[PDB]
Design a protein around this ligand. Structure first.
Ligand SMILES: O=C(O)[C@H]1NCC[C@@H]1O
Length: 262
């Protein structure tokens, strides 16, 4: 329901986003909305098939192509307008995934830049993309928050070690940054793990270096990540290596959900 004005970031929020390369908006969705997304996530974890990642499952990819709920979510007036605003274009979804770190579980996700994968694997011409991470649970110091180098997107794509899409979905990553490159960045820029309550959205740049650590809390950390790409910056489908549920190929510009009686 687009029953009120489309959401936009304030000028200060935009500046903060461009300068740091990430930004948290608190309390975007309420508990009932988050519960609908948790239930739909659980159903996709149960029947995603080859799109799932694992012991017990912690990942699924491309759900907005298969789920009515997730298809509407990406068009939400809480999300689509800000993605247009930050990318200064019409947009489409390049990638959709859900990442759960359960209580007392999780892995060390090595430092990486999303754009590096999308440039090399999918043919994304420029880093004119971003991810919206919806917090299905409160993100704290202790349940494995996404961790960033603030301003580290202004490096461009950093020269990365390489180890098809064999290890793109897994915490041992195909493209990871040197112990060496990372020290220089962090001495200069520091590190930040954005936190916020359930229903928050964390916007981050395609090129920001990020990482995370296990969840040593007794609470789950579920994240829905929607990667919006500029339509002008659509991926070169001739250099693409991965299926539609990792890298979308329908570049129709999205429009927002209209308010309807159903
Ligand atoms: O491979 C991908 O496209 C995603 N998984 C880890 C880095 C990206 O977000």
């Amino acid at each position: 329901q687009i029953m009120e004005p489309h959401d936009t970031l304030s000028p200060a929020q935009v500046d903060e986003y461009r300068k740091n390369g990430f930004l948290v908006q608190e309390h975007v969705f309420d508990e009932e909305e988050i519960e609908l997304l948790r239930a739909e996530a659980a159903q996709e974890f149960a029947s995603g098939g080859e799109r799932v990642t694992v012991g017990i499952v912690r990942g699924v990819h491309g759900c907005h192509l298969y789920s009515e709920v997730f298809g509407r979510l990406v068009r939400s007036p809480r999300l689509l307008p800000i993605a247009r605003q930050l990318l200064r274009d019409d947009v489409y979804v390049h990638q959709f995934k859900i990442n759960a770190k359960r209580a007392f579980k999780g892995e060390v996700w090595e430092w990486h830049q999303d754009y590096t994968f999308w440039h090399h694997e999918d043919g994304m011409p420029a880093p004119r993309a971003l991810s919206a991470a919806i917090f299905l649970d409160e993100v704290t110091e202790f349940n494995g928050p996404l961790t960033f180098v603030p301003g580290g997107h202004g490096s461009g794509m950093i020269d990365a070690d390489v180890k098809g899409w064999a290890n793109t979905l897994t915490a041992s990553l195909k493209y990871s940054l040197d112990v060496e490159t990372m020290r220089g960045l962090i001495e200069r820029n520091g590190m930040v793990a954005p936190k916020g309550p359930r229903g928050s959205v964390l916007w981050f740049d395609a090129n920001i270096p990020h990482s995370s650590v296990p969840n040593i809390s007794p609470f789950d950390r579920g994240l829905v990540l929607i990667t919006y790409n500029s339509v002008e910056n659509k991926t070169d489908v001739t250099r693409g290596t991965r299926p539609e549920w990792l890298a979308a190929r329908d570049f129709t510009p999205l429009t927002a959900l209209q308010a309807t009686s159903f």
